[model samples]
Target chain A: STDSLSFSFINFDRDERNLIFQGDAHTSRNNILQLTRTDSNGAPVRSTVGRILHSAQVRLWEKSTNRVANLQTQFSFFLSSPLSNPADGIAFFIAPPDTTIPSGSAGGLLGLFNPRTALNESANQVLAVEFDTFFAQNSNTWDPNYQHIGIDVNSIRSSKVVRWERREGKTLNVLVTYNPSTRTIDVVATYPDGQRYQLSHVVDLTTILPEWVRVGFSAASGEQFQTHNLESWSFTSTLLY
Target chain B: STDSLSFSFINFDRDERNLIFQGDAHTSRNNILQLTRTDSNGAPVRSTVGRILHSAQVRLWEKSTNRVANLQTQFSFFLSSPLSNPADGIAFFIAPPDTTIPSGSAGGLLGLFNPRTALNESANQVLAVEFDTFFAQNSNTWDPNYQHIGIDVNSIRSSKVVRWERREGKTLNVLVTYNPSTRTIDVVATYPDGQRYQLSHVVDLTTILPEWVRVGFSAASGEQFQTHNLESWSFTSTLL
Candidate 1:
């Protein structure tokens, strides 16, 4: 059954173009999932080359941050230096179900949503765990010097400090768990040696999560940078525990 | 006499290049001043030239902001756009008997010293009337924009604003005077038409001048930009 769902170009029907069919596509057409690759030019390069380690205990949920269920994720892979600008990187997140999927490259792929299609201004349509790699220089927006791993509440620039780290050439392993019972989010990072370091405990997830979430990975490279591939990804979410 | 004085440099060189020119050196140095034209390559070029106008009455006072009596001047000229940057422009001023000669070219001739030099810092250098055609962009010591005229006191950057105007042209005329008794510095600007408009009366000369003023013209066209020659000058000074 795992082999049945593992492949590229997972088409849903005649209406949907290159939609990847993994789990239940319930609330929306593009909601289920995608594990895609970006080429050397920062374009999406599709393939069914990697393995998708899937499990059933995972279910998807949507609710206000004050009353949402918690989700946890873990994955492993090796990454070659595929981006032109060392600062250009990717992000993994558990966002609200209502999060509007962004458009094609140039600017949309980074989980950067247009203000037109999304609702809930304060912390609407979002809750994200980001692994930021690209740094923009001299512009009013981003500083081009460092790489960071952090959390974004709803908007792109509005992020709270849980734990952040900057470095190059090293492998990074991260684990994040959201416990709905206590309304707490715990994040941990481990080096290649299996030694775990708890970076930050942001007990305030209620202020970050919206009514819906999309569990996935997103990559973005801008005017001066390029990202080449999404090596591999395998994730599970609880639909309703 | 004014026409004769207009075509020559007015040398104020102290043989030892120091304080005062004690004797007949002042009388013998007559007709000794010179202005030379140079090409962009720093090679001497041929061009119409003029003399530096100065006041003899400037010798009477000691180092202070007091205005020397009867010193007056007015001149008009047009500059052809320079081959490179015009290294230096011109200045107008009324000072007491003080020791400070203007620094040429890199400092925009008059601007670098008027507003920020140590002589002005000593408050010994008084009112400066400047027509600066060049801009030294990064010199925190001066304004970055290329065109301007200012009245600087002790420091080039810290002087209080009297009047400043910016224009795009290769022509300018400036007039400046100091009255020590009332400590007033009067400044006026005349375009090519010869009609004069008052530009500043901001700083009181009595407040800035020190005694024994060295009054005249200094120009330069350093490594980057330079001009052919100073056109001409004619001035006179008398005791009040």
Candidate 2:
């Protein structure tokens, strides 16, 4: 038994202490957290990026020690967009504590990295899971599965990707667990329909990120204006040092 | 590292193991698990009872030892009724491994205990959390909060109860955790409208039941026919 941490939010409420909302992110009068929102007339703007991070950095591991944490998290969200396009997407990222929303990170970048740092593993260190909905008709082959989910490692080009269609305005759920026994990051996403998709990879978080890192949510808009709503989230971590 | 067990179901497929569904409980074509249901014409039946139990028993404590588990469980559900009324409600229970829905346990009994044993502490040995939606408009004032929840021990009449309204057809969420350090059972339920209710109580499982106990869901239909759907559920327990 060692130090442990957990936090859950049904809604952000009037004010939140241990959380940091940046860029376009804000809480509605009803306390629903929004990464992007529509205008008063039901239309949305494009070329926008936003993020919401926890004020305190997570301790993933310890210096020169075998200590690490087994993490479990679940969040309910809704994704929608107008103009018949659901460009860009949202991500759950673990990056350097001082990381910020980079310039040119809007659009297909998903707000994780900028165009200059898109595939630069050495320049931007991050581990993230992206729920992307953009097919990018730019005649580029790098983007596959317009509506898909991927586990990004130090870059936007995730080594693994799977299809997961978006249903606008419907409540969706995601559950992620990092099991130390198998060194696997297991993720399951459920949409409005009964069906669900699972992705599991044997990636160790200690190897990618430092002992201390900031974890949060990020999203961006591209050709179409999109809105992402986070209804509820709960996180639990057991740190063994 | 200690002994850890976890199982999650987005929707139960055709076949499910490590789980036992009894009585009127069944899975839909879409794999949704329902404790009770409505008829084809959008109406529901009465005096129906059902329960879903995990095949394996949970080891909450050890024999004559201090070993106990820290437990965490979450489930999403929906409650609805066509008769413009909701009744009986449902429960999450941990009981004897061989426990079964008692006779006359339907309706407000929550498929937990019968009229002969309504409040008999020695008649049944069970611990449960009930999500009740009906407040029998009877002359008696025993049942408070027309729509409420409670933590019950060995009987249908819970020692602790709180207000929690039910919204039909919309998804609701619940998170329950038992921290051995505090010997407290913590529960948080969220409705589709975004309001959430929380309950926490200090109780020792070792003094109430055997080291191993069966855990699952139980529900009943009273005056108004109702349907209960389980969307997604996940449970994790760490045995030390």
Candidate 3:
């Protein structure tokens, strides 16, 4: 909608730990805090302390309710040694916005929460892409139940392999790009091994996005869990004719 | 050993309802039952009753204390609706002879009596076979773990098959043949479809037969569920 709006953290020195409003804020488990560009004034402003803790998430929507022509995102984080179990993982979500969502906890991260749970009862409001950590035998019904990362259409029960990586404790980087003209959603993940696994050949965005969506990250910690500390995240857009 | 033996049921006919095996009669719930001849004697017999029931197998075998051929068996019976579901079916079995033995219930029939239960724990036995009505989930271990027909060797787990037919309220004609030269066992089953499935592969007898043996049939009932019935059976063999 806007001419190629891109937000870069380069301007802010590494010590500006609280610059949260340059993006958006999303989280759960009474622990997450992060930065985003949307402020209380309804004008785009920068804020900090945007880190999500225990199991929380943060999202940054470039423009209020404006669907952009193209979208790209990248972020990194670690799985604390205290949460060594495969079930204690997190996901990054790009979904349609829903306001009535109550945070859920336990059983890994809140990614286990979907429309099926009483929390987010509103239907068809979010088009989600989740980077699931562990496979819970019961919770797999929602989204693309991945051992790792992939795109999830609105419903939680179905999943397709964009990429699958072994469970390891370390930094991980992921990128998701969307093209409105071709209606495709492409995803890729890079591991410490320098190996990159492509998740989608082509994800038709027309099938997932019809309007503006909330771009953000979500995480959670349940019984016997540890916190997922976020390092950084960025959102950039490409010019549309 | 006797020169020959004749087993007869007087005042008995297929219509006699159910014969009171008189002595301690063995019954089955989820296994097969058979009747066969062996070298030794004094083992208890078993059979099943309830619903349309399935196969009735009887077997006989020698003891670790005897010096002769180990176990032999014969089978007969019919099929009927499974206890609660009525959609599934049952099977039968014949095991090596052993005294102080618990009933064969595996695969529900052959090894079903509890984990790793042994037959030789009882007195010398006569015929033993299972009326396996359900499939066990595990492969080869027998018991209610998965589906198939199996024979337990020496109170241990043994043979099984999945490609067999099962139905309710139908008759089955069964037989087993043993050849001394090759020392193998052959089993044949005639279904109500008029099709016969035969498996005569002989396993090493030394595995089940230690020395002397008894011969008879066994069966069981569980959940007070399906009612499997057994009419009559006769075992005839040569005296050596």
Per-residue accuracy of model 2 over B4-50 as CA lDDT, tens digit each: 44555555645453468788888776677888756776455788888
Docking class of 2: incorrect
Best by TM-score: 2
The ten-residue window of minimal lDDT in model 1 chain B covers: B1-10
Ranking by lDDT: 2, 3, 1
DockQ of structure 1 = 0.00
Q: What is the lDDT of candidate 3?
A: 0.41
lDDT of 2 by residue, A106-175 (tens): 8888788878878888887888888887776472145674678888888888868898887878887888
Ranking by TM-score: 2, 3, 1
lDDT of 3 by residue, B1-240 (tens): 121222322112222112223112333322232221111342222233222111111222224322233233344565443344321233333333223224443223332243344444342222223345555444333354443344444443334343455556666666655554465666676776788766655555545443223344443433222333343334333212
Which is better, 2 or 3, measured by lDDT? Answer: 2
TM-score of chain A of each: 0.57, 0.93, 0.63
Question: How well does candidate 1 match the true structure in TM-score terms?
Answer: 0.34
Best by DockQ: 2
Question: How well does each candidate superpose onto the true structure, as a TM-score?
Answer: 0.34, 0.50, 0.36
iRMSD, per candidate, in listed order: 47.7, 16.7, 45.3
Worst 10 residues of 3 chain A by lDDT: A47-56
